[PDB]
Structure formats: C-alpha cells, structure tokens
Symmetry: C3
Subunit: 338 residues, 3 copies
C-alpha cells in the first residue's frame, strides 16, 4: 500500500550518531532500522561493579535514530532466543498503541516489524515497556534510547535563522539501582530474573546507586573524551527515560537549548544549566570558544562526582585571553594586606 | 459595596469539572463556591492500605473551581464539628494575606467567607495552610485542589488562534507518606492526630510511599478510565501541591502545553513529557488521533508502575494505519539471519 | 594590554546587594572584586545544630556580584593561611578553563587573580570546584554564590518595555548534609577534614538534612524579614548550586520570571511557582499589591516548614479590599445548614 523509497540505516554505538543530512530536499522515505535486544552482565563503575543489564543493540543507551519530519520509520525488533524475557518498544515520537508497545511484544526467539510516521519534530525517548512493574525495571536496566526527527530544513533559531551543527553527540543518562548486602557491598546475580526482587526494593526508595553516561562511570572520560575544535557548533542530545537531569557544560554554555527537546518551539539562549525531564530528551547547541578540557555533568554535583555522571570534551585550538585570563598566578598573600 | 450579579456554582468530584463556558461575553460576576472540610480514613492502594486523610469536599484532590478573569470568587469554607483540627485555605490565584490563609483559619464548628478577585489567568493550586509544620502535613494528607481562571475569550495558542476543548479532566497527583512498622508493613491509626508523629518522620526523608492520581492507586483505571473519542481536543489539568511531577500521555503528546500553567504565556507545542513544579498546576491540550488505551503517567516510571501514579484513557474510534501499523506480527527469527 | 577604567566594588553580605546602576551609559570597565575564603563552624538551625562550613566572605551564600554586559570582571581570590584546604572558583558566567576553576586553585596562604569577560547576560552561579569528590563537598559546605550580568539598558519584558526594580534581594538556598549518630542526633566535628567521611555518606543518599536560605533556618524571618512597600517592584534573585528548588511567594506571584535566569530570553508572566535548576540562578520581579507578611518558600512544603526553607517579607502599606476581603469572620455553622 505505502509506495515510497526504502532506505536501510546502519546504527552506530553512542555517543556517536549514524550519518544523516541536516537539511534535505529529498521527499519522505521509509527509513528502516533494526534493534536487537541483548541481556548481559555489564560493568557500570570504576571499581568493577557489575549488574544485569538489558539493552537495545548491546549499549546503554540504545543508539540514536535520525529521520526527518514526514518520514516513515520501520523498525525491526529482534529478541534472540538467548534472552530470558519478553521485550517490546515504545517510541515517544509515535502516535497510538502506547507508542508501539502494544504492537511489539516479543518472546525470546521472535521478531516483529512496526512502522510509525514521524509527524512530530524533536528528540524523543524510546524504551522497552512490557507491562506493569516490568516497565520501570526494563528501563532502569538499560532498555532506552532516543530518536531525533529533524525538520526538512534542519534546525532554526525560532527567528528565521538556520542553525547547523558541525558535530553531534548523544549522551544517554541512566539511573541504576544496584542491591547491596548488609555491609553495603554491591550484590551480583547470575541472571536478570534473579536480581529482580532485590532490585525492586532499591527502586522503591527512588534513590539511584549510580547515575552514568553511556552506560558506566567514566565511560566518556580519559581516552573516550568527546572531541571538538574551537569554532565548531556541537549539538549535544541528552536523554533520561526515568529521572530528571540538569545538564551543564563546565566552562561553556548552551547557546541554543531545547530543554523540552521539541524543534517546533524556539530554543532558549545562553543557558548555564538546563533541565531534562525524566521521560524525555533535550538538545543543546554550543559553539566552542576556548580550547581545553570541558566537563559535561548533571549539576547535582553529588551525582556528577560521586555516582558517575561526568563526561569530558577535549577541545583543540588557541586560548583567547580576551575571554579569560589569569592576571596573576598563585602567590603568597602580601604581608601588608589587611 | 460590591454590586455585581451573584452565581452559585455546584462543584463536582474530580476528575470531572463543573459546567462552565470557555469564551464568555458575560461581564464580571461574584462566583460563589462552598468547600467543606472532611477528615476521614481512606483507602489509597490496591492492597487496601488506609490512611488518615484530610480533604476538601471528601475527595483527593479537592474539586476544580472554574471562573473567568475579572470575576470575584466568594468561597465559604466550612469545618464541621465532627473534625478534630483547625483548617484554612490559601489560593495561589489570589493576592494578599498568604493567599487567604491568614483570613480563613477556622476551628471545628465554624465557617468563614473569603472573597478574592481573579486577576491572574491560568490554573493554580489551592491548599490548606494552618501554620508551621501543619502546612506540609495538611497538604500531604490530601488538602489541596486547583482553580482555573480562564481568559474571557477562552484559550488561545499565543499566535492569535482560538483553542477550544471538547472535554476537560482534572488529575490531582498526591504524594503520600505512610508509616511502616519494623517489618515494613504499613501502620494504621484511629485519628489524624495519632498518625502525626510517625508520619512526620517519613515526611522528613522526602520519599513518598505512594504517588496517586485522584486519591488512590488505580483510581482512574479499569472502569474509571477517562473517556474520549478520536478527533476530540481534551484539556488535562494536572496539579501537585508539594512535589514535582512529569506528566506523559503514553501513545500521545501534549499538542499545546502550559507547563507553568499560566495562560498569559504562549503554550509549548508537541511535547512528549512535561513538568509540573511542586506547588503548581499545569494544563495540556491534546487531540486524540488514534483509538485504544492510553496510559497517563508521571514519567518516573517507578512512581507510575510501583507507587500508584497511572491513569487510563479509553478512546473510541477507527485506527489510522498511516500513523502506525504492525507491518509483520511476531514471528520466529529467520534461521538464515546473521 | 587591556586599557579600560578600573572600578573597585565593595561586596555586601546577602541578602543585600552592593550599589550598582540598572541602565548605564558608561562603557566597559574592569570591575574589581575580592573574595576571601573562610572555613568556620556555623549554626544552621533553630535548635543550634552546627556544621563545618566553607564560605566565600564568611557568608552562605557568597555575595552577589553585579556587572554589565561587556564588562571585565577581575576577581582576587584569597585563601588565608588559617584555612586547612585548597580552594578555587568557577564562574558559570565565564568562558573557558572550567569557568576559571582550572586557573584559580590556591593553597592556604595564597591568592590568585582571574579576569573574565561578561559576555552573557543573566544571573549565574559561582562555586568552589577543587576537583573530583571535593567539588560537591565544597559546594554543599557553603562555597557558592551568584553573579548578575545586566544588559547595559537594564531589564526588559521581551516585548520592548523597560523593567526597573526598586529593590533587589539575593536568596541563596543551600542543601546541607549533616551526619547523625545512631540515635539520630546530629554529630559535631572539630574540623571540615574530620567531618568529610561521615558527610560523604549522607551526601550519597541525596537527601538533605536541612535546606536553608541565607545560611540558616529562620535567617530571613523575624527581625531579619525582608522589607518592601506596596507598589514597589522587587527583584528576587535565587540560586541553588547543587539541587533543584521551586520558589513561591505566598500571597504573591512572579510578575516577570526568568526561571532559567538568562535575560536574553523573554520572562514568563504571572507565575505561582517557578523552578530553579540545581546549578543555576533565576530571577523574579514582583510588584507588591497588598501589605502584610509574605512567606517566600521552596514549594516542597516539607522542606519549607520542616527543613528550614522559609523567608519572610514584611510589606508596609494599605490593604486593598477589592483584591481580597474577609466577607464574614469565623462564625458558628448555622444550625439550619444541611
Ligand atoms: O570481591 C568483591 C570485589 O570484586 C570486584 C572486582 O571488580 O567485583 C566483583 O564483586 C562485585 C560485587 O559483588 C560484582 O559486582 C562484580 O560482578 C564482581 O566481579 C569489586 O567490585 C568487588 O568489591
Ligand atoms: O504539529 C505537528 C503535527 O502534529 C499534528 C498531528 O499529527 O497536528 C497536531 O498539532 C497541530 C499543530 O499544533 C494541531 O493543530 C493538530 O490539531 C494536532 O493534531 C500534525 O497535523 C502536525 O503536522
Ligand atoms: O556504602 C556503604 C558502605 O559500603 C562499602 C563496603 O562495605 O562500600 C560500598 O559502597 C560504596 C559507595 O557506594 C562503593 O564505593 C563500594 O564499591 C561499595 O562496596 C563501604 O565502603 C561503605 O561505607
Ligand atoms: O588548551 C588548554 C591548554 O593549553 C595550555 C598551553 O598548551 O595553556 C592555554 O590555556 C590556559 C587555560 O587553560 C591559558 O591560561 C594559557 O595562557 C593558554 O596558553 C595549557 O596550560 C592548557 O592545559
Ligand atoms: O492485616 C493486615 C492487612 O489487612 C489489610 C487488608 O485490606 O488492611 C489492614 O491493614 C493495613 C495495614 O495496617 C491498614 O492500612 C488497613 O487500614 C487495614 O484494613 C491489608 O492492607 C494489610 O496487609
Ligand atoms: O498581569 C495580570 C494582572 O496582574 C496585575 C496585578 O493584579 O498586573 C501585574 O502584572 C502586570 C502585567 O505584567 C504588571 O504590569 C503590573 O505592574 C502587575 O501588578 C493586573 O494589573 C494585570 O491585569
Ligand atoms: O517494603 C518492605 C517490606 O514490607 C512488606 C511487608 O513486610 O510489604 C510492605 O511494603 C510493600 C511495598 O511498599 C507493600 O507492597 C505492602 O503492602 C507492605 O506491607 C514486604 O512485602 C516488603 O519486603
Ligand atoms: O482501538 C484499539 C483496538 O482496536 C482493535 C480492533 O478492535 O485493533 C485496532 O487497533 C490496533 C492497534 O492497537 C491496530 O493494530 C489494528 O489494526 C486496529 O484494527 C484491537 O486490536 C485494539 O485493541
Ligand atoms: O548536647 C546536644 C545539644 O546541644 C546543642 C545546643 O545548641 O548543640 C550542641 O550539639 C549539637 C549536636 O552535636 C552540635 O551541632 C552543636 O555544635 C553543639 O553546640 C543542641 O543542638 C544539641 O541537641
Ligand atoms: O549571545 C551572547 C554572546 O555570546 C557570544 C559568544 O561569547 O555568542 C554566542 O551566542 C551567539 C548568539 O546566540 C551565537 O550566534 C554565537 O555563535 C555564540 O558564540 C557573543 O558573540 C554574544 O554576544
Ligand atoms: O530524626 C531522628 C530522631 O533524632 C532525634 C534525636 O534522637 O532528633 C534529631 O533529628 C531531628 C529531626 O532532624 C532534629 O529535630 C533534632 O535536632 C535531632 O537531634 C529525635 O528527636 C528524632 O526522632
Ligand atoms: O498589613 C496587614 C495588617 O493590617 C491589618 C490592620 O493593621 O489589617 C489589614 O490587613 C488585613 C488582611 O491581612 C485585612 O483583612 C484588614 O481589613 C486590613 O485592615 C492587620 O489585621 C494585618 O495583620
Ligand atoms: O517482560 N519482561 O520481564
Ligand atoms: O561549574 N561546574 O560545576
Ligand atoms: O491545624 N491543624 O492541625
Ligand atoms: O512511553 N511511556 O513510558
Ligand atoms: O580542596 N579541598 O579539599
Ligand atoms: O501557598 N503556599 O504554600
Ligand atoms: Cu525489555
Ligand atoms: Cu487542613
Ligand atoms: Cu573550596
């Protein structure tokens, strides 16, 4: 019935994003994506703590999918027979049937194909939602990602001016609830099923043990820092499927921020810290002006520094002493000061 | 002194709203409302847990009051002699005297009449506020509702276009703090006074035991699902007097959202999830496009699924396969897949 | 190299703000500020609980600094040899080097001079950020304040109209994490270093023991209530360096609110409650219409009433019975009522 060109997209692992155009003169296409569920034990902190994760495509978050307004998105969801649980997928970008969750429930050994029309622009969460208490459990076990639906003309500033990004990163933030024994040590389990009852008890107290970007504390630091150059406009897409976050680029700003994540609304300008509502994605554009290390955090600094929620950008270029300078290096306080 | 027509309004129990006009060519009236305080034990979850509630008009939330900008709102507050505590009322919509709290303190056996002018448009919280630690205790015991002050021309989209709703629902969200015994079982008390000291201890840790819509887990599910039809524009008013919430319509969107709840500000368009600040009301307009079950949740999914914060909409109509379709039902993964 | 006039500013203790112009026809200046770190035991609640604070200039919050867009801000940071720890300063208003943190680390006995250009308008947080887990610890120990960068033409309503305030107050909100012994009593320590390990354990559970304005429960109540007059436009700057807040003026409104705190964005109008993201400052303008006591709170009323987060305004003037009146004082319920 639906007679449009089909285009297969190969997803890549976050924080990177598959190749796509910003502005396009192409008409609506059927964009084909495949997501494979993988249940697996993963390391989530720098002391080696593990937990029974559940993922789309082996990563937390799941990959970012990028399409344009008016496209049709055809998603094959695969639940391999090595998994132990039923899974599904709900797209906040889609209309009807609980975002598709009601049409995509699959047992291990099955697959399903859903098609939804991208009628609403913005960044949106997708997540597993099998039903009842399984919904939060699957989500906080890692089964969430995001989709970006761009306007066909690309981004604009809400006042008639085009905005173009040179680079795009997807930072998925995950709240985790890892059970502890009586001495406070983290517990380990041989399967998701075995972890469930203890995990639910932690979840009920609503306080995460870990808050991570890209699936583990320190994932986007050190040699996995994100790269940029002075003068580049970088789009940072941030999602949180379950709990609020307050992104902040230390030493920078959000030049243009869609904190509710929807491109039909004009962005706010010059933010210090923005706010991602749990269950949503947002996006921030920033043009780097200074080289050096930047920390991207949630500005609950306890979460950022002590629970895992810090990423680094490494920015190449020349220092601008007009914007900031050390006038006098650390020196002894003058004895003749009051 | 004030010589305007008087109009008695009969309130109805949430989630329904008393009859009112959107746009009106009537001039300012004195709109007369009565609220009766009722202290009573109520069931708040599906396992039958009870707690010592305190309510306006026997319901959590208290009823929605609807007036127009420039109206005068004359509220009779009654505290029957069967109650045990003093109560009052503070309207976030009103100006002066702590929103009226300073003028409405009444002992059991008394009543009081307050008049305030509706100078500010939007949805607003009202709540009991007797003084000091009694303020949070009364509010989280259920003594809160909302008032909507419409512009005389009804809603608009902030760009010169009228917005009209076909239906309106009021969803009051309540955080509850129910004491537990040493084994974790919920405790029961013979009066609010007896529950106070144990309840305060839970409140101090800032983590609710339950988060409910319309006063109990499952209140707006099953046979009390909210009804709509494909093509209808539905206004959902959401209040939270004490704690933030992040409403989300699963399978839908917020077409027009006033998340801060004030109609002098243009709405945001096409939201996935919005944000109600604790101590505020907000409103979202959505035109249903697909039939079926929709879950309305706070998108902390732990709260939604495990603490009680899920409502259902049942929407009648015909399915639109253009917007979403199952291309291939669950089937075995092809043996010839990689 | 930089050849502009220099102007020394003398800071004052919050909630007051040093003298400054709103609109200015002066050109860019180098505005010189000095901040001295002071570690000291402080009382933070009405029962006399103490904690090992760390402050800029002896106060929580640190003082508000006010400059205009295009000014250069030259800050001398002094760490006296009586302190025990290294400190630094990061300005969310500044660009590069982690907001200046990377250029300002000083040991006890040292001082440093940083210059940054005020390129972005709004209110912004500044805070200590020495590195790693020390970042949250220093911030929640009190080392945070705010800077306001005004447009040269002063505030506007985003629709071409000037806004001018008659008075300005800075309300810094601080989440504190005070260790308890096994009976629940607060612990005391002889130094910040000794408190660290127990404090970190409380911080990890993300629930404050106290939430205060101006450094202690009741700081801005009683005789330290903030003064205003009917008809005065008052600007309230509110900062929270680590945790979200939801300001509300009980009996009032926010006439014009920049909840994200950035003056390049038009304010929202007529808010009941607004939202300060942790890691940010915001500002609200209100013109008092009624005399009397107003409570300024975070509208988590548990925090407001039971954890310390309430300030008072005392407003002088004449009561306006048109806006609000008690039509009938408390009286016995008529025996002939149903
Ligand atoms: O023996 C405990 C010790 O070993 C580590 C080393 O990386 O990890 C093990 O124990 C953890 C807690 O049960 C598990 O999460 C992990 O799967 C296991 O390899 C340390 O994290 C831990 O303290
Ligand atoms: O607005 C984007 C997109 O959503 C649709 C429905 O799929 O329209 C919704 O939003 C419109 C603009 O606010 C409303 O006027 C309409 O009633 C509502 O369904 C699309 O038609 C529109 O392109
Ligand atoms: O957190 C309580 C308590 O547990 C211990 C081990 O008994 O450490 C655990 O918790 C720490 C904080 O989450 C982790 O850093 C560590 O991996 C974990 O074993 C104690 O060190 C701590 O006091
Ligand atoms: O890119 C940051 C990196 O560059 C160095 C020299 O290679 O210094 C530059 O950046 C400093 C601020 O971080 C400036 O103060 C300095 O003047 C400038 O040359 C390194 O020191 C720095 O890590
Ligand atoms: O006997 C405990 C058992 O009975 C239930 C049945 O609905 O409710 C009773 O006990 C609860 C806990 O004290 C009370 O809240 C309730 O008022 C009382 O009827 C169960 O909820 C409970 O587990
Ligand atoms: O704005 C709605 C309504 O509020 C009042 C006071 O009751 O005005 C406030 O807001 C005006 C518009 O922002 C301000 O200009 C005014 O100073 C402030 O009191 C009403 O006059 C107005 O209709
Ligand atoms: O929550 C701790 C612990 O308490 C038990 C009974 O001992 O259940 C209580 O708490 C549950 C979660 O809130 C409720 O579902 C139930 O109504 C209540 O009695 C245990 O089941 C649980 O481990
Ligand atoms: O209204 C939802 C309800 O309608 C049924 C048939 O009565 O199916 C319709 O809705 C489905 C999506 O939920 C579509 O896939 C289907 O094609 C459409 O006919 C029921 O299956 C469904 O519960
Ligand atoms: O003896 C405990 C009792 O004294 C008070 C009186 O103000 O304060 C003391 O004890 C507190 C808890 O250790 C300390 O924070 C404080 O420094 C010390 O003077 C009461 O607060 C306390 O209950
Ligand atoms: O916008 C305020 C201020 O920020 C600067 C950089 O210091 O510009 C940023 O924001 C501009 C307006 O959005 C962007 O166009 C620009 O690319 C970005 O660096 C200043 O130039 C501007 O005055
Ligand atoms: O909070 C638990 C428990 O501790 C006690 C003293 O044992 O009081 C402490 O905690 C109170 C609430 O934070 C404070 O008001 C008080 O200053 C502190 O000592 C008990 O009173 C309470 O049950
Ligand atoms: O300014 C408030 C203060 O004024 C008094 C009289 O001095 O009363 C005025 O304010 C009341 C509302 O708070 C009005 O009801 C009253 O009519 C008005 O005269 C005091 O009662 C009040 O505390
Ligand atoms: O559906 N999963 O447990
Ligand atoms: O400025 N960063 O916390
Ligand atoms: O005023 N009530 O406890
Ligand atoms: O999409 N609902 O969680
Ligand atoms: O740097 N301070 O611990
Ligand atoms: O209206 N104040 O809580
Ligand atoms: Cu799943
Ligand atoms: Cu009450
Ligand atoms: Cu410090």
């Amino acid at each position: 019935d639906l007679k449009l060109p089909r285009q297969r997209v190969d997803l890549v692992a976050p924080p990177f994003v598959h190749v796509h155009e910003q502005a396009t003169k192409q008409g609506p296409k059927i964009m084909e994506f495949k997501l494979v569920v993988q249940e697996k034990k993963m390391v989530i902190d720098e002391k080696g703590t593990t937990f029974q994760a559940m993922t789309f495509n082996g990563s937390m978050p799941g990959p970012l999918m990028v399409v344009h307004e008016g496209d049709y998105v055809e998603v094959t969801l695969v639940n391999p027979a090595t998994n132990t649980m039923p899974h599904n997928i709900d797209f906040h970008s889609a209309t009807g049937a609980l975002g598709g969750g009601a049409l995509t429930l699959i047992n291990p050994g099955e697959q399903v194909v859903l098609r939804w029309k991208a009628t609403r622009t913005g960044v949106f969460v997708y997540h597993c939602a099998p039903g009842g208490p399984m919904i939060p459990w699957h989500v906080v076990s890692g089964m969430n990602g995001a989709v970006m639906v761009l306007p066909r003309d690309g981004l604009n500033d809400g006042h008639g001016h085009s905005l173009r990004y040179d680079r795009i990163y997807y930072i998925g933030e995950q709240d985790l609830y890892v059970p502890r024994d009586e001495k406070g040590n983290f517990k380990s389990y041989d399967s998701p099923g075995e972890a469930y009852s203890d995990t639910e008890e932690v979840m009920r107290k609503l306080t995460p043990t870990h808050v991570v970007f890209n699936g583990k504390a320190g994932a986007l630091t050190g040699k996995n820092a994100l790269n940029a150059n002075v003068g580049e406009n970088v789009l940072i897409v941030h999602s949180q499927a379950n709990r609020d976050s307050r992104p902040h680029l230390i030493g920078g700003h959000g030049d243009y921020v869609w904190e509710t994540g929807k491109f039909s609304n004009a962005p706010e300008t010059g933010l210090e810290t923005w706010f991602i509502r749990g269950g949503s994605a947002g996006a921030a554009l920033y043009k780097f002006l200074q080289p050096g290390i930047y920390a991207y955090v949630t500005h609950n600094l306890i979460e950022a520094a002590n629970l895992g929620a810090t990423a680094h950008f490494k920015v190449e270029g020349k220092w601008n002493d007009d914007l900031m300078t050390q006038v006098k290096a650390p020196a002894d306080i003058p004895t003749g000061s009051t």
